Amino acid sequence: PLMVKVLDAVRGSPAINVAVHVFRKAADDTWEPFASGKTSESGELHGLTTEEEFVEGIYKVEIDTKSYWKALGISPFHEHAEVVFTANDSGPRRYTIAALLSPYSYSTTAVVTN
Amino acid sequence: PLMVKVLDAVRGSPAINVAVHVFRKAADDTWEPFASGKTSESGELHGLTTEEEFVEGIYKVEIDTKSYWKALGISPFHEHAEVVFTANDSGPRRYTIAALLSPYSYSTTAVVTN
Amino acid sequence: PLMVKVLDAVRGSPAINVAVHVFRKAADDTWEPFASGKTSESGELHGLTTEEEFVEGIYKVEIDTKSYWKALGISPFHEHAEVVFTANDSGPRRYTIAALLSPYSYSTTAVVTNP
Amino acid sequence: PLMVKVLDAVRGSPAINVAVHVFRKAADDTWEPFASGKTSESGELHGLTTEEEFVEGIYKVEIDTKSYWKALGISPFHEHAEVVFTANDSGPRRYTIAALLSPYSYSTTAVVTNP
Numbered sequence A, B: 001p002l003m004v005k006v007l008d009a010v011r012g013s014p015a016i017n018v019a020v021h022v023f024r025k026a027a028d029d030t031w032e033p034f035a036s037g038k039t040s041e042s043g044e045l046h047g048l049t050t051e052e053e054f055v056e057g058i059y060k061v062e063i064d065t066k067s068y069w070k071a072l073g074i075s076p077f078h079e080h081a082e083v084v085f086t087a088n089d090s091g092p093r094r095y096t097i098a099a100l101l102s103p104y105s106y107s108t109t110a111v112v113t114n
Numbered sequence C, D: 001p002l003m004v005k006v007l008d009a010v011r012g013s014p015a016i017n018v019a020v021h022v023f024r025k026a027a028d029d030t031w032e033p034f035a036s037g038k039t040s041e042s043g044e045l046h047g048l049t050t051e052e053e054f055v056e057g058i059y060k061v062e063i064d065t066k067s068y069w070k071a072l073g074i075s076p077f078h079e080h081a082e083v084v085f086t087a088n089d090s091g092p093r094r095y096t097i098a099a100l101l102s103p104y105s106y107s108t109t110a111v112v113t114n115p
Ligand SMILES: Oc1c(Br)cc(CCc2c(Cl)cccc2Cl)cc1Br
Pocket: A005, A007, A096, A098, A099, A100, A107, A108, A109, A111, B005, B007, B096, B098, B099, B100, B107, B108, B109, B111
């Protein structure tokens, strides 16, 4: 139900071995860890959660872009990229969070399908 | 060797049934038709060409964004989106041209892999 | 030294009346309020801070995109757009944080200059 | 009535000295030269045309991104960034065409205002 895909706008490639952390907003407004992993050779991260676990709520996907750029020897602007959204059962069942990274910029979209 | 993928930033969905035309630049600097198709339910267009046909050269991928927006009842800015690039045998063998569409904006990247 | 500019990719316009909150990470690792404001008719937000006050640190610029889209009667995907960066770590710089908004997407870039 | 602004997503800066060519589609469907120029130190290009000359039509703004990246010693993917649009079809408007460049990617948006 929740996939992440990360691309590199400098190399023209998937962004490989990027750390990704997902958090769920708790009742006291703190961010509780929920799932995490590293993107694969295709820039994708699957298997974060399951339909049972992924209930409605506010989630934050933190992509560790700074470490990615540093591993390539490139000087970056951002500490990380953030994607904060509400999971909604009224819409389609599968969320893909896609991000496109540059040293001083990032873009993100949601692809929400059944 | 050449895939196109198109996403919709308004609906948060693949951009389905978008017409895509690929042209190759000819010796007299005109654009000759090369391949075309329409994106699938996943927003993807496969099977445009083959490794034998897809020789080095300058190619233009024209995505008919205006008709896409009009079919959804949305008033667009651009006539089409353009992606013009040189195919290079020194780099990886597979090109994916990805585009993310909004009514007054578009973004595109290349994902070039082996 | 810290300005924000926000554009609307649906309308082809500045994104007017967008709330922006800036935080700075404190020594205890919490996010301290730093400055806030709203974009103008030009999509710009000036006057958040001063060179004196804008010291080195890790800053988070939170752009309230959901509130923007909801005020236009649209149900968007994201809660906000966040831009988190270390500022002034090799002396003072001037930063422009630009964002381009759509209901299910946003993009951001920084323009950093040395006065 | 027609301005261009170009930013560099690698440097976090304006994209300076970027060549821009504007064409207009003619009655025979060819692309006629219309105006050209280069971005300044601020990444901006003003003075391309005049309200008199900028009549209704289909315009193509070609941003010479490959030449930019090559001048910086970088081998980029795209030949150029193209922005093709119908202008002034419900009377005069003022257009800003903005682009954000990376070696394998670009994004563009339009800001359209009614004077
Ligand atoms: O499989 C996919 C999926 Br799903 C999504 C994208 C979109 C990447 C993108 C972003 Cl994230 C922001 C601006 C422009 C772009 Cl082209 C690409 C591929 Br290939």
